[PDB]
């Protein structure tokens, strides 16, 4: 539970479907903004 892959796949679920997700600070409505967060997490690996 210090894994980034679980966080990425969580947002991949939302990205594939194109739905609004709350990331515990900001609700990224657009899958563009969701994927941007995936890119921030991607920089960890």
- From CA 5, how far away is CA 43, in angstroms rounded? 12
**At which residue do the structure tokens 């900001």 appear?**
26
* Containing structural domain, residue 9: 1-45
Determination technique used: NMR
Strand runs (DSSP E) across the chain, as ranges?
A: 21-22, 27-28
Q: Residue 30 CA to chain centroid, in angstroms?
A: 11
Identify whether the C-beta of residue 15 lies closer than 8 Å to the C-beta of residue 34: yes
**Which residues neighbour 42 within 8 Å (Cβ) at sequence distance 6 or greater?**
8
Backbone φ and ψ of 22, nearest 5° = -90, 120
Q: Residue 35 CA to chain centroid, in angstroms?
A: 6
Q: Please state the domain count of the chain.
A: 1
**CA end-to-end span of the chain:** 15
């Amino acid at each position: 539970h210090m894994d980034v892959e679980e966080q990425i796949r969580r947002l991949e679920e939302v990205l594939k479907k194109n739905q609004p997700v709350t990331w515990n600070g900001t609700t990224y409505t657009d899958p563009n903004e969701i994927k941007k967060v995936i890119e921030e997490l991607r920089k960890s690996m």
